[model samples]
Target chain A: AQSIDQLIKARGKVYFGVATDQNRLTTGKNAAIIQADFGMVWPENSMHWDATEPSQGNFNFAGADYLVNWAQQNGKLIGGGCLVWHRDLPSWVSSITDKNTLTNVMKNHITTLMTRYKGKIRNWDVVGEAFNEDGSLRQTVFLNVIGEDYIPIAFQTARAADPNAKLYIMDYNLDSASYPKTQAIVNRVKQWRAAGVPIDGIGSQTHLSAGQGAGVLQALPLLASAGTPEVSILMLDVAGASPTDYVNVVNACLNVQSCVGITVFGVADPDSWRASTTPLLFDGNFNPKPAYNAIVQDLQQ
Target chain B: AQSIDQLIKARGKVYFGVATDQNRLTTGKNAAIIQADFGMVWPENSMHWDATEPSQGNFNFAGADYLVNWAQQNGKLIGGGCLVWHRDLPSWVSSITDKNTLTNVMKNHITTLMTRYKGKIRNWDVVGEAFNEDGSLRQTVFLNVIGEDYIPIAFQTARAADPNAKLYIMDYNLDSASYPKTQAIVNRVKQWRAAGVPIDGIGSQTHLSAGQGAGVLQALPLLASAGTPEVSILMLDVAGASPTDYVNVVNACLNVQSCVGITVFGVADPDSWRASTTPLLFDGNFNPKPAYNAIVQDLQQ
Candidate 1:
């Protein structure tokens, strides 16, 4: 009878969260399941750059507004989603020709959005996906135009925007030893800290399959030792992931003292960005998949 | 000497407008000029799809909000900007493969935005830049996925969201004879009228250079006859155009009974989209250029 949210609370350490969308919430049925099961809500696409400021100065709070409002009404924690990323940008943004102007634009955007939603949003993915699989700085408009300074500026600006929100640098491909991207991120965090730039946490985008539990366990200690005060398995929706797969990752987080929580990328398979394949604890129909039961049983134990 | 807004009021049939941005308005000096001169305001980039719903469902109204709020406080008319467009899209929008989903997304975005700004916005560019140079449907994601049904649907959704707002199909390259795109738009408007699709006005993005005044004059009655009750030269920033060039366009609009108004694309030349060349009535330093003087003299006549 215990839900994932209840189970996480019972554990008294880390919380369980899910990413949900406005379109899905409109069905009401899905909202009930989300409200009951998830203690935290990360808006799937609502709080990203494209959604927030589709244009340079315009900030559309419609989608994020729904999620944040829903979270407050339901006593659920809200993630600020992201402040800056190379992907999902309005095309005009990438075409910004000047470096200083782009930096100011980025800072202003972060300040304005964060200021509006300050004290409400708890965590911010300050800079998302800044590295490649090879542990190199990704060739993004941000990297190309603003240089590595983009990351520090984004975090610093987010801090100035909302002093209350936890700042995180979120990226994927970090849990693989072959990739070694996690070490690069750790080094960057250390560098930022040494240089007096603010970065509170590292979001290990632990998009896990069954065998990847060891990789997440491997990355956690490294992150914890790197002075990462907070760590989150921000994404854990792997295609064909079983109940055991979900439990393995959740258990790994529970074991890591610094690991704050695990946020599944979606509520159900049907509503997931990875809907082309089964990727979450619930099926397309919102029926608890084996993965859901597995997590509950493991948590109960 | 009547200001532009005052001149439009005295004329009684039309309004003088200017496209403005947060960047310029952040400097109070520019805002003063805008407040004194213009009766209407079109957000330069705030309400566009790329700016509004940049990625998909994410709406960023930070820039647009500043303008809209400023306009309301100043008793200025506000144009809700574009509901849909071929350009300025978040890259992901064009990549959506599902036709039905994309259609619903488009409608939902239009509905969500217009509904929120319903009474506050005076006009909606329901669908922008839909036509090709030859007057055929421009090859865009909306056209490719939803076909031409996107046009009527956008207008219908806007009407459903806000019945009072004037809906316009805005486009450019109309004021050049070699490209008779204006006639094509006029013909399409007539077809839409016959088909019972609502279209209140035509946004002639008359981005003219010298000697293009006659073309605008010719397109005016054609658009009017095609059942476009209101016509706005939505963008008028002529590269390398002289003061007399601006007067010519203004005089042409003045001569036409149905020509509603002209909106310069920015407060000054350096701030314009065409910043490489001086294309606005004001110079970079916020001083009146020859174009501004010429317009005043011609309007006085």
Candidate 2:
């Protein structure tokens, strides 16, 4: 049985990860595979704002707890948080207009989540898709109420809650050096770091619809080299992507010295966020796709 | 059990339908629901170019046959064809450079299927998504090689194969009267009819994400009144669409004398193309959602 973790470690990469939830973790084969193949486990939906803090001053850690406990028992590194995001948001939060109230609730949501897991989570997605494609702060409730200051406030609160947890600003289309979104994230990451922000890394999520491996191969090398301490390749090679492009994405990550890990958006194709198009490495039958073989191939390097 | 078809017919609408394939037909509950609830059936995947004629000069009807056979056995009115689409295309067809070859193959693909099912399919989607959002041709292989002339050629071929079957040009966002795509469709429908083209109707697929029911209600009346002989609501109410809006869309069609029918994208939410968000009227456990109740409620009129 070849372990993705073992192969990844051999190549000086930290971990091979999958995003999971209580239901996916409860699947017998899914659980077994997670323990055996992956060195890291992250919750895909359980940690979402709607699932975690559905109401004002209300928190549900049952789903996230199951995942963390599972990860700990299996010796898998745990990654957590969407501390603040534009989507999967509770209506209560998004409906907020009062600046101070929104800021307080946002801080409380991040603090409670980070405080509960603390040192157990190795890395966290502190803020997701906070920047627009045109290199401006996306006018989310956070931006509308509290302005860009929400970014530093959220990151600071997360760090205070869990000093050891690595914080990342995750966004899509950053698999390109020239994509406006990528440049925006780079500029923001640089600005935050310069401004004594607690942001530790960047999570570049590559959601491919067609062939984007060449873009990723070119971008990851430069993106990782842009001086972020770590870059985690978060979810690449979606519907219509060729197996060769899949391999290219893996090799791109391998080529980057600062890129420490890769975390796919889901555990299997059937239950993926984009399951209709079969976005992930594993098929509906739990069989490894050629995409899986290529990742393992790169891991052996 | 109150049948959707009975309720729809009571309101002067022709039929209430679903998109299905062989595998979906094989589902015990799914099969029973189709026979009980729906009066119209269209192949969701099996009739696509890739599945029907996956290669040069070859055709496979095993999947389409299964669906059509089921429809005939159950007394369900069959709605068929994509005849042409930008997506779900076989590689050979998309890769073609020569105009005559592509045109011939496209005609052959339509004629073979239509000729076999002559008079069986009550309504057929002869052309799908041929126009862009901005009202220009989408530059599909058919468009690129055969130019806009592909439209008239396709309709002529389809009509020649089955003189009795009603042919519809289908596209998305046509639920809106002002959407440039809808205006373009209206203009084209007028031009073709004036030119003695065989085009008989328009299929408006309203794929909603949020509260688009108001939009549908406002748009459908204006859209249906735009001199199109018949307007079929191909599919509506996807992920995040509200139940009130669902009823509004049904009522919108009811108010439009020319709007003859409605077809949902899928039978249930779980296995839907956008299943992760529970887009349809039935849940994963085969239970009718609030959206379903709303449609059936409007059917009582």
Candidate 3:
């Protein structure tokens, strides 16, 4: 009857967490289950640039505020998913050419958002999905106009905005067949660290199947040794995954000395990004799926 | 066979100008007419926010750059038609609600653009179409979130960016039956000048008809005496205007001692917003319409 948070701590390391949106928090039903089961909560879409500042000068903190308040009231840690990404960007942001202006825009967005949440949010994905599968920086508006230096700029800006929050770079496909992309990120992290870029963590969106552990296992040590103090399996939602798959990924993360936590992408299957595939530890009805049981059973051992 | 520039100089106080887009500059026919008939070139779409920063960081200077280059090469003054407006906005700008973030975004955009074209662009519509026909602040995203403070913010930001550029608030329907809107603008200009917001001019997008003369003549002196050093009849295209109508409007602008200049909306009818009605001085085939002849005759007198 122990919660996942307690079970994970009892196993000596890692916190079992889940992502939730505004609707889930507002409804309260799903929030109760999340509060009981998870030690951490990721405000999935609410904290994204589009959801936060869909227009130029307006900030909508209604959804994010609700979730953060709930997390604080429940004594759960909050993760600020992202600050900059190519996708879901406002149309105005994607077309900026002037470097000084673009940098100002990026820094302002980071500073404003981070300062608002300050100590309330524990971690921030300062730069999200910044690379393509081939190890090249994604040719996003930020990359193309602001240049590659934007990544470090973002981290430095976020650090200044919230001195206490842990800063991270989060990306998907890093633990998939795109192993070189992971390797490239490892090099960039080392470079950034050497350059005094205040990057405290690296989050692998370890969205995987049963057999997708080798690449992640290989990349984990490189990121760890690069002075990335905390490495988190940020999202673990495998499509058509079995309880064995969940156990395998969670166990792999636990085995790594630097892997601080394993967070299922969402609380319930119906609310996940891959909702049609039922890709989480909880089913649509908020019942503990077999994967949830397997992770609990494995951590208990 | 004197050029409009020479004719305007003979009149001793005004410049004949026209709006030119990328197409007009690219095609030699339109450029030739604009060069001979106009003293100022307003890069209409090229200078707008959506045109410059369509996405966010990616700037498309190809069109605007080419137009600016052509104007420079031809010894023509450049009028940066606008820095801010509600229409022609990228999807992202209109949706923002965060006052702080939106203001920062606006400031950065203005500063970057104005700084780049400093000294080269003679005039700027710093805040465009900010008022409704009824003399009220338009319920734009800026007004709704940032409030009326956005007008001053835009003007101040633009002034700081380009100290030498003549900053103005440009709007349409000023020469219509909406006398209150013109009065509202005059009042705002006076307030701005008194408050040191660096508003050097007011641009009446004088989209007018034959009988529109009285309204423009009435508004011009009030704006002038209100410490507005320069006022432009920015766009003088009339949907079903005659040669006499064009002469009447030009003559009225000429008589108003503070009305610094008049800019026809487009180089030719085909390129005009009201293409169906031949709203410009030049017909679709680039031949001088009666409106063109009337202006030339009036300038000579």
Candidate 4:
């Protein structure tokens, strides 16, 4: 229900995007944010191989395109979807998962999607959800199948296809409370940059809480630890029960001048959506509540 | 020679103060700027053991008081001086050969300097010249006799002396091209704060060359790497073969937002003392040199 004028006027700048899961490509609320906001969408769950390219040399962009085209029509930024994480990998692709095949899969998918979105996309979440909370690679379908070189392979392909677009390596698990994960992510990013991956930014998803926001700023040496000039608060998820908590997150963003854009979990109490009850923004009568005012407050700051 | 009205007229809010060593103090230049348009003083590097506490437990406030009184009377901020470096260390300090006596001597000096100048001195370059180019100890009398623990011990003593005074660990070696020394200093400050030593800032003594001036901005991340709120530019020992180099250093300070103050080496380049030199306008003959004009240029912005 947030109009572009409302969002942009209050926040000074809008990150203007959403994480689009292909499972909800044609869904009501998801399409609304995509078309209305002209958002850059990275598929939350359906971009990996098992769903898109299950058989050898067979790639799927059909569903991801539904979200991508909607973004295009709305003049939105489109980031080539999530890669290097296991949850979205097709069972067939995971089964074949030899180093050579996985490499080809990474190279082919990145090149194809990046080329299609060449001038249109603003960034790519090149490798999504790779690190565990401790910043170590989760031995997911990609890591187990392709090894660490998979990071370079995906990023290099994306850069080759669309050199102008920013390449972001996204992970949703790192947090300040888990120092080991934070340290590991920092170490890996450092290693990746040294290894010459074209990492333009990092996406720290719902990995932080309201209290963790301050600790996150305190540990900013970890967030942009890769030394990328920008950080996308891409998948932030928080439940601000009080005005104070919402303001805390807003102030945290303002305090961290290094943050390029901060994306809140747009709908209030977004956690309730898991039970399929349409758990945010609109109350039972489809009228916005006080929590919508919290969004307004966060934007004002 | 510039009055407060004239200086305020020329530079607006940008008055630079310098330590004008007691040789200058003997000339009363230290007290003059404290009263003139410029506002600040290193005041003879007077915080060291020999200068402030030449005799054990008996604090000498003569020169420091000249600075404090000048600043107090003229409404200028008097930053405290270098207390822990080797250059001005008193030879007569009690039992330099005995580690405990040396620590006591240093601690007493800190207490005296910080306590007497508490409200007047807004900052203290409490520990100075403590690191080498290799990021190890500079092997001062304090370090050689009392050991590495002396660094934190001096800071702890200074904090205890004036709990509100901004405390800084000042170093020249940090501006070296090799960033590790700067990084090492950052780690030391981090360690001190983690240990609850109460460090408030870092001071980069850019006894810098014109060639190295731009490089200092890059080196500054090392100072605030652990989230320092303030930093001081103790620009001792600089000269411009040409006005460009001098302007470059001043611009470097402006470029680095993390540093709050930049005190030029002094109001005058002492080199004019040699027969071969041209006088700088502020400190040299009344005719303003290119460097003087450049200072006016950037300060206008």
Candidate 5:
């Protein structure tokens, strides 16, 4: 009955989550471990806009329903990957120039999905990757057309659709407090909150290479400084990174009060989006590697 | 003949500038040295909005006229300290809520300053300290009413007023490239430039602690990466910040092609705003200290 989720939860952390999809749900033991060991499951793609509804005024929930339903059957809580993002966006959404139309499209897409999964979903990445590496807004269709207030508008719409769901604006590649993107997110969170947007969490999709543990360590406190908003360490990596690095990453979360949870991007290394780099907890053969053991040992000790 | 301004200029560097005021200009030998050793003189306060136009529709150029007139009499280019800033602001400008009215006020303010000093002024901090420490735009009265477009509007107005003057946005406290403030400034410059704002330079008021050379060194290159815009090292510090630190700062600006010039906030340490810190090239007695010697040696070497 000893598990990572229970162990970390005992320490007052939110959850230990893992990303899953229809394909990985059949990894059997690899898949079984997620439900057994973790408390939350997030989808890799099914919940994205393109996967759910790629055309204007069109609706499709087949892929998301399949993944979310399976995830619900387990003991896992549902943390939605993203309800709005620039990437994996439909061509029609990108093609629009009218501010009101884009606003409607954003509202309809978020409202539709959030309403469907309202009670089941715990949190949402209402906006994702909306900033460039330099911490500037990513000049997306949303920014160019709907203006700087698009981010605030998205969160507002999501809150209206599902007041129960904790909303988030997620971004990646923020390895340190020195990372501009990390600071920008913190700045924007305070700005939005100061102006009364109900943002609840900051999702850091921390896909890292080996030997970046110290940067990740220093940067978490930076992200956590976004006042009352909790932080989720999403897409934390594995493989070539040292076991010490794993300890540092988990230790960083445990030490920061605002950090509520962490979710590895994949169950095993070979299945990671960066598979060649093997950035996950388990090895290709589905065996727990040093990285996994390091995290577990850190939590227990 | 063997002055720092000429020595550094030979290496394709811009003027070695000093921050001067009517008081500093009368420091006699201290003031005499500025004309002999420097080719650019920036005002410490006389060029600021409060000093020029503290009341709405009222104009006063007595202080700026004295300082600028003196600097022009010497072989120097006049770099204006700030055309717009939040500090030392008059209450009349801060009381407005109407966006169009604020826009016109900004236009009138910048145009009046730029057009009056157009040819003599080499560059202007069209906007200053528009960002907070977390790299978010500071919620000044300008931002509170006029919206985010105020920054672009300010630069566009300045460009129209003086097509020959290079325009800059000045921000301070950036000691490292890892500093979120540094990244935000960099991000905003790119955003402004890409969106057709005629911003020509970044003014980093590099006020540092005694031992922050490493941070200052690392951050200069980060500031330089804002595409084609140049950089100026304003308020380079002194006293306990090792002589080695002086070389590092000068060397950093020298190595960075985007770095066009350097200006100490004061001619002597006792005269600096942070006089207790003794942050400048000359000691209280107006003698060239180790910080000054180190920079000269670095340029010669």
Candidate 6:
């Protein structure tokens, strides 16, 4: 209902903003507003190599840099990358058809960008959605080219870029309890841990659509057992069912010991989605929806 | 720009209100509204035999009769029949695999409904989406057993039941210029025309996304040539593009020799692909946008 930064800081918890370059933070505002203990710098879809150098050797940081700059300027916490979405690769990457070029693109994009944003960004989504619903490799270009070693490579790259930065294997469905996909990510986390991957956290993208709220509530235990050295609910959309029910889900995520904190899609309606599908808390007019009141009430609780 | 009936009449063109047993109109209201030059009648997705009958001999006219009574009272032109969606079918007909039973369902439902509304309803979407985009017959129960002959059979039955009613085929993607599926239907229409098959028109559901105006425009000409049949642009999102452009599209359709008319999706902001992504002519307040002015000017032209 009020200042999102104030609400989180008052709770004595770390606060992070999940966003890409297109969704830059409000600039030239009267003041630096957020007072969260730290901000996690992040981008959406796949902030991975293919998207970066989609056209061979052509790296684009215009969007990702906006996120990094905003977090740095605000002195907020910075969590990092989520490279998934095999289909998002530009035609060049998909048509490369060579395993070495594919691996090099993957490695170069991560190493260059993470290194550039090091010290400013703290956590990195080292690998994402590497497993299929049945706990097998997803058979994407990365897995097919680099073998399952791509997961550790991501962590290793991040470690080399910024040894201080924690690495996390991020995936959707990991916290949405009855989903076969979530169970798969959990298993992959175990494999990463056994192989001495420097995985620092598990990032859950609670991208469940409507009618899956009950299932999300049930998935907390599975997420906790996954060898997520640390855990966080990165980009959560709750009010989809009901604002109050969303509060309950937020509470549930907060209760999970693995979850360091929860980042709601929007303090006001977040225009995070391709469209303003959700009110993002505020209408285009910047007025609050019922979600604003619900979040404030729940925060007070 | 306002009500279509008023606009078409002003333009010295025949216009009529379409009615169905749907919530939008009752028999009495439909009759009153259709007093225009022509009246159209169609069932909600419920006109199918499987929809009208669940038990072997049971039929339901609770809804279809509403349009019939209205069309009869108003002495207006009428059209009917919609494609198969599971929700409209009676559980019994959906389960039966017999061609005769299914054909009989189509025949019985059409004959009875058209008989009751016989003289009033002029056209019908006798068959819809009988094939996939790849030119394969849709695995619909109608085609599954009755074969490609199902379309002709349904039209024959419709003509016999309401000898006066014009029969037409309705489908989406028919407006895709490259859709071989639509071309196939056109070929069938030509064959049917040559064979003395009862056919009247083609219906294109132009539920277009914002950027598809050009695409729809391109498709219109292709559809017009197939059989020289009357091309009905069922423009559900007629006002979807920018005001000037949307109005121009409508004007183009109005001017096109084969485009008999367009059905407006109303003055509301359509659930277009880009509705939320871009600014609309109608805001949440329902106030007309600058696009509205463009629409008005275009409609006036």
Task: Give the number of the best model, judged by TM-score.
Answer: 1
Local distance difference test values of all predictions, in order: 0.76, 0.78, 0.76, 0.60, 0.78, 0.58
In candidate 2, what are the lDDT values of residues B165-276, reduced to their tens digit? 9998888877666788877877777888888888888888888867777778777766665576788888665666468778877888888898888888777554565655
Every model's DockQ: 0.05, 0.01, 0.01, 0.00, 0.01, 0.01
- Model 2: what is its DockQ? 0.01
**For residue A5, what is the lDDT in candidate 6?**
40
Over 4 Å off in model 6, which ranges? A9-12, A16-41, A44-51, A96-101, A238-241, A266-279, B1-295
**CA-only RMSD, every prediction:** 20.5, 24.1, 17.6, 26.0, 23.0, 20.2
lDDT of 3 by residue, B1-301 (tens): 3476678778876578887765445432567777777888887666777657665654545446667878899888888858788876877888778999899888888988888788899888888898888888999888988998898899888888988998888888777434788778888778878998888888888776555665655566665666788887887788665876677677767877777888887765544555556677765345677767777788887
The true-versus-predicted C-alpha distance at residue A277 of model 4, in Å, is 91
Reference-based lDDT, residue A105, model 2: 93
TM-scores of the candidates in the order shown: 0.53, 0.52, 0.50, 0.45, 0.50, 0.50
Better of 3 and 5 by TM-score: 3
The CAPRI-style docking tier of model 4 reads incorrect
Residue by residue across A1-301, what tens digits does model 5's lDDT show?
Answer: 3468888998899899887765456422546678678898887766777656655655545446656778778757888868777885878889999989888988988999999898898889999998888888899888999999988899999989999988988889877888788888889888889999888988888777677776777888888888856887887874475787777888888888889988877775544555557567765445677777777778888
B53: Cα error in model 4, Å: 2.1
- lDDT by residue (B1-301, candidate 1, tens digit) is 2477677557654678888766446432467788788888887766777656656666566567678878999989988787788674777888897999999999998998888777998788889888888778898999999988888888888888989998888888877544668778888899997898889888888777666666666666666678767877787877775876777777667766767888888775544555546677775445687778777776766
**TM-score (chain A only) for the predictions, listed in order:** 0.95, 0.95, 0.94, 0.79, 0.96, 0.82
Give the DockQ (C-alpha) for candidate 3.
0.01
- Candidate 1 vs candidate 5: which has greater TM-score? 1
The candidate, 2 or 4, that scores higher on lDDT is 2
| Candidate 5, CAPRI quality class derived from DockQ | incorrect
Return the clash pairs for model 2, or none: none
How far residue A51's Cα lies from its native spot in candidate 5, in Å, is 71
